[PDB]
Amino acid sequence: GSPGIHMLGGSSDAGLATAAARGQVETVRQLLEAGADPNALNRFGRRPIQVMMMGSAQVAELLLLHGAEPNCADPATLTRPVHDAAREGFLDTLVVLHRAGARLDVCDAWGRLPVDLAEEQGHRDIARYLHAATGD
């Protein structure tokens, strides 16, 4: 067998994710409008939107209207994209998800629901909107 060790290598059409976490909608527009895949997963397995710093809706809408993964999530802890925007308080990204068919009814592994994790930390404005758009 060929010699090797620890990881190996891999690239993507995911700049939309790496740049998003860094607050870069221009790069997300480039990694996408340049002719790429709407699901360029990242080593963080945090979907293309779950890893956008949840501080710039400009990125949440970019991939959403394209084909991001607002319904899929991390199978290691059932972490959907609704919980990410909830732990931060970006109610804008929340509208985008539900504005393009989103799965607002999952639990972050053992966090009951995204609405609870919101008001739990310091996001009541988003928590109230979630319970009204997630269904008890």
Q: Are 92 and 58 in contact (CB under 8 A)?
A: no
Interatomic CA distance for residues 86 and 95, integer angstroms: 12
Q: Are 37 and 48 in contact (CB under 8 A)?
A: no
Method: NMR
Q: Which residues touch 73 (CB under 8 Å, ≥6 apart)?
A: 47, 50, 79, 80, 81, 103, 106
Q: Are 15 and 49 in contact (CB under 8 A)?
A: no
| CATH number of the domain located at residue range(s) 1-136 in this protein | 1.25.40.20
User: Which tokens is 105 given?
Assistant: 């009814």
Q: Which of 94, 97, 93, 89 is nearest to 120 (CA)?
A: 89
Interatomic CA distance for residues 22 and 118, integer angstroms: 22
Interatomic CA distance for residues 87 and 105, integer angstroms: 16
